[PDB]
Every structure is written in structure tokens, then in C-alpha cells.
Amino acid sequence: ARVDLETTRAIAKQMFSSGTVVEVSSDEEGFQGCWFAAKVVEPVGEDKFLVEYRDLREKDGIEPLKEETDFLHIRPPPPRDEDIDFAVGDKINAFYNDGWWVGVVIDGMKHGTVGIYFRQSQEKMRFGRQGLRLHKDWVDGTWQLP
């Protein structure tokens, strides 16, 4: 409980209409702390939205994945601020495997790459700068830093 259900539902109803570009998350195992790009096909009921993924595909690998998601797992695309230089300890998102995955900066930028660690995979690697962003949370219609 660090978001308010009433407000979140209202804001989601307001902003996520047909055609709206969004990010959606999943409760499925191994997908905690990941945001996928998508677009609202249409709202469903009062709490849900049919979305079509920008990058994720159906099993043939060709047709865009389509799924229902609820108002607690959908958000707008965050502002990108690319004036940013990452510092060690910064909570970030890194784009790979078709998604924005939560990670932590473990080494400052060198030669256009940043050292990154992912807690989910317990894996460490260097990422190209333009595949990284500062992590932000969508709360009650407002973008906030951690």
C-alpha cells in the first residue's frame, strides 16, 4: 500500500483509452520489476485494459502479443531525461529481452557503457548508455523517484 486504489483506478480510466501508448507489468514469476511497452486496444470492464505489446509476440513469433491487464499493472511511458549521468547505486531500468528490467548501477559510465547488476538473474554486465534509464514509479497520477 503505497498507492491508493480509488485514485489509481480513476487515473487509469482517464488516461488509458484506446490507442494510448503505455507500459505494463506482470505478476508472473521471474517478471517482477519489468515493464513492457504496449498500446491499449480498449478498456475492459471498470478495472482492466486489453493491450497489444509493442515487442512481445505470440508463439509464432510474428503476431503481437495481446493480453488483459488491470489498472494496478499499467502506467504511462516515463519521461526519459537523458541529461543524466548514472552514479554507483542508482536504481535503473535496462532494456533487453524485449523489456525494461530493474537493475542497479555498479560502475560509472566508461566508453558509453555502464556497469549493471540484476538481482533477479544475479547477473552482472555492461550496458550501452542509450539502453538505460533512471527507474521511476507511477503513483497516484505522478512520476516519482525511489
Numbering used by the authors: 206 to 351
Paper passage:
Here, we identify a previously uncharacterized H3K9me2-binding protein, which was named AGD-containing protein 1 (AGDP1). The AGDP1 protein possesses three pairs of tandem AGDs (AGD12, AGD34, and AGD56), all of which can specifically recognize the H3K9me2 mark. Our biochemical and structural studies reveal the molecular basis for the specific recognition of the dual marks H3K4me0 and H3K9me2 by the three tandem AGD cassettes of AGDP1. Our studies identify an H3K9me2-binding protein that regulates heterochromatic DNA methylation and reveal the molecular basis for the specific recognition of H3K9me2 mark, thus establishing an additional linkage between H3K9me2 and heterochromatic DNA methylation.
We also performed structural studies on AGD34 and AGD56 of AtAGDP1. We obtained the free-form structure of AtAGDP1 AGD34. The overall structure of AtAGDP1 AGD34 resembles that of RsAGDP1 AGD12 with all the peptide-binding residues, especially the H3K4me0- and H3K9me2-binding residues, conserved and occupying the same positions. The structure-based sequence alignment of AtAGDP1 and RsAGDP1 tandem AGD cassettes indicates that most of the peptide-interacting residues, especially the H3K4- and H3K9me2-binding residues, are conserved. Intriguingly, all three tandem AGD cassettes (AGD12, AGD34, and AGD56) can specifically bind to the methylated H3K9 mark with preference on H3K9me2, suggesting that a single AGDP1 protein has multiple H3K9me2-binding sites. In contrast, the AtAGD34 and AtAGD56 binds to H3K9me2 about twofold higher than H3K9me1, although the peptide-binding regions are quite conserved. Our in vitro binding data suggest that a single AGDP1 protein possesses three H3K9me2-binding sites and sequence alignment results indicate that the AGD12, AGD34, and AGD56 can each capture an H3K9me2 mark using the same mechanism.
